[PDB]
């Protein structure tokens, strides 16, 4: 049994998730910078709307490290609907077999947290 290591991102508009270049990989203290690369995969639930007609809810997006999860066979950057690639500077373009996916029986999801940059590069950058 398999799951994203992280909780989902809720998309609030109509547009797909977008991330600044070099951002989008969830924070994870005990992670190597070689590993900071993967994809978000969209999931959409449907329920009845206020008019009784089936409708889509806000899509949720789940992160998977590169080479793991439902699209473990996709190479980084491959175009596919419902898939958003993200990578941090210095990440290695290699499958993250050792990280794999989360077994929900043994671990709860890690709260997905993104980095917070400055509006423009400043300070040392």
């Amino acid at each position, epitope marked *: 049994n398999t799951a994203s290591w992280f909780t989902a991102l809720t998309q609030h*508009g109509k547009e797909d998730l977008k991330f600044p270049r070099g951002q989008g990989v969830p924070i994870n203290t005990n992670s190597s910078p070689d590993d900071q690369i993967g994809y978000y995969r969209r999931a959409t639930r449907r329920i009845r709307g206020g008019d009784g007609k089936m409708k889509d809810l806000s899509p949720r997006w789940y992160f998977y490290y590169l080479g793991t999860g439902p699209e473990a066979g996709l190479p980084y950057g491959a175009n596919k609907d419902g898939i958003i690639w993200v990578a941090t500077e210095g990440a290695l373009n290699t499958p993250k077999d050792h990280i794999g996916t989360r077994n929900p029986a043994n671990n709860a999801a890690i709260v997905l947290q993104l980095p917070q940059g*400055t*509006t423009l590069p*400043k300070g*040392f950058y």
Partner: antibody
Amino acid sequence: QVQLVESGGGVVQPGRSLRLSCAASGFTFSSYIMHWVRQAPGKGLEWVAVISYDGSNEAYADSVKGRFTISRDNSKNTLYLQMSSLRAEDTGVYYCARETGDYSSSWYDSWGRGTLVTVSS
Amino acid sequence: QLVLTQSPSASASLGASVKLTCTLSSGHSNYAIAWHQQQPEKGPRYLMKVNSDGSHTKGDGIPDRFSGSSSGAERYLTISSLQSEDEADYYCQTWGTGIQVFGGGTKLTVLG
């Protein structure tokens, strides 16, 4: 004391152009990132534009991109906003704001008094 | 997708205390925010930066009766010993690479 004084607001016909200015004093202007922020009557604050210390980098809210530019004259301690293709929904008070000098964050630590921009016939 | 949610209004009695709430959208529960006060017919004034661990840093000249705190995706501004001058719209501000975001603002009214 840090001071930011906005000028140049007034009436502008729709589709026309208008430049705002902000005169800064009381600190080293060229050491700080500077922002424009606006507020339509009775609504909230909305970020407009940002310019780096030396004017080499910039960014814009999606609602003004391709119509407004931001610029900076460090010798004269002045920040500008060139507005073009103005629409009625650009009406409001425009504020100059100073980004903190903190290296790791971008909150505003000082605000101007604002200048009113009226897009109307 | 980076969105700050504030309730439109709040009220409390003179001399009492009030807690205003800003909520970060999903994935940003670790972000710091800033609180700004806009008194009637005035421009805004920076109050405070609030971090996700609950710590906060007042601006210069801001009284001790203003404090900040945090829990999960929520950031709080607490004002005690409420005075008439404390009636204002309060805005939370946050930031990220290429972006600057404001909440809708909370109008505070001081009764009695």
